[model samples]
Target: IRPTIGQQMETGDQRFGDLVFRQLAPNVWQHTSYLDMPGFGAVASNGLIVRDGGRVLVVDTAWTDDQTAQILNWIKQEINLPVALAVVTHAHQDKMGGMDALHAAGIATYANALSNQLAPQEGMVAAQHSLTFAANGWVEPATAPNFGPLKVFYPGPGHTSDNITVGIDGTDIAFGGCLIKDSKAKSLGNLGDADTEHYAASARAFGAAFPKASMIVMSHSAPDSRAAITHTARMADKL
Candidate 1:
């Protein structure tokens, strides 16, 4: 029998319905998978990779060191590209916990501008973990990952003060990170402890700031267009 997304999330499994999406652009792709959890159909997560020239840019590590290894290995074997940078969407443990592995692989990880400086001061647990890794001699992700001729951007914090949206200008694609959730999607967890005001402002700003982006994809769910972004804007408004 076919398993549900909730089952995937509860069990820490990412293989259930693994191929729900793909890259429709040049050197840009999204690999969809799941992490099993009880009562949850599938906790959707994504690793956005962009191959620019000889370098590969990876975004987010999901759960633990092993999960990150899966992503890195897939990129290496599938795309045969070298990762020069990794971008952490936010400071949640499940999101940032795998930093140590990425660092060990010589990947330079990048967090939001405010994350590194303010997270721990504000009692951000995820920030604390990253610091722990670095103090013990772990390398972090890089700040830059070009998609062909495009660059990355962090319009502002949405889900958390550390949230950064990755943009690939040339392809008109922006990795919304967790800044924007699937508009047509629904969630089972609380998205608070974040600046709701920033989220509201970000929704409006991202649209204006990236009006040229032809497509937008959240870390979870399916690829979306301008409409999805707007829907997410409404979701933040309600939040």
Candidate 2:
């Protein structure tokens, strides 16, 4: 059951005390936190907490260690499942910043080689745990971290050259990272490393691969949105 966007920000009786865990599916949840800063104000960032069997999988990390800690605590207290894997979506802090804490907890962390290369230059700590699917013959458009039903694919370069999408075999949810945009996004949100020339086509590659996906989760978006993939593809198409 999807929660109202307003309920995502409310503080009372939130299942996760220090963080907001919005249930998107029976086994999938979205956690949002704000990056409070001068120009940024209260910019929202997001991550996924997926529960499967006796383990869990994390798509992205909160922007701060404290917030990430809260999420880990919630998983321990409520879900009571060990995190089998935590995949950092991109080089941005909103995606990879929580690596330090995840590393501290000895949770296996993984990222594409490109994200590992770029995060360090962005002033964020390198995950050092990254691997290249292409180099390893894992190929693009279809790959896995040797974990659950999650399939990681390189959706071509958009938000960043290393951006990828993760899909759960039995669920309609696709973690699009920043490569996909929400319905409310006026334009490609941030193009710091964006390949504007190929962004739209990349989105199409993603769309074609996940035509059955009913929910697309994006970083910095309000909540799960089915329109996000198409909206982003169209936006990038017109550019």
Candidate 3:
């Protein structure tokens, strides 16, 4: 049976058809949507829903606009808080596929300036807001507290050249996007736009930046501990 909103928050789990919302910490929820690939069967992509005060911030969109609208509606009905803004972790469709939906709903979207430059090449629209960072640099909430309660960092290049990670303040939850894989990942899933030469260093930077990030949320799999960061680094080193 579907659980009530209160139960969802308390239990830290909620499902709406193929979309799932799993809480990672207090006021931080992971929203997962799926995609069916030819050989991969069904694959999952994870995003975030972070609530602070009366505002909410979303990290990444679903794989399609329809799925993204479902998340937007769910937040409006369940959480009852206005989304302060949305952040796209990369230029991939799994990360920002719902850009149209978010724009249609009048929500502002942010992404690394590099992601914006790469979006069109990926056949995806860019986020409305552009965040510029130095190479391997980061932007923490303390630097842009009004933006939201998450820290956005770019650890050079890994899964994709513009891929970035988001860390929730006051929580050990770090949304690794596609940069850090789950523990069970045997290989780096997709390297179409990956920078193999720098992937290892990128993973190491991610791990070091969030030393307390025990719960690392990935795009295509379930959340794992900080070990996943090391695992990704090791995997990249072999590549």
lDDT (tens digit, per residue) of candidate 3 on 18-44: 798887776878899988888876778
Ranking by TM-score: 3, 2, 1
> What TM-score would each prediction reach against the true structure?
0.74, 0.85, 0.92
Please write out the lDDT profile of model 1 over residues 86-120, one tens digit for every residue: 76767665466577778888887666545566545
After TM-score superposition, what is the CA distance of residue 148 in candidate 1 from its true location, in Å? Answer: 6.7
User: What's each prediction's clash count?
Assistant: 26, 0, 0
Task: Please give the CA lDDT of all the candidate structures.
Answer: 0.62, 0.76, 0.84
Candidates by lDDT, descending order: 3, 2, 1
Single out the weakest 10-residue window by summed lDDT for candidate 2. Answer: 135-144
lDDT (0-100) at residue 155 of candidate 3?
82
Winner on TM-score (1 vs 3): 3
In model 3, which runs have C-alpha deviations exceeding 4 angstroms? 1-6, 9-12, 38-40, 140-145
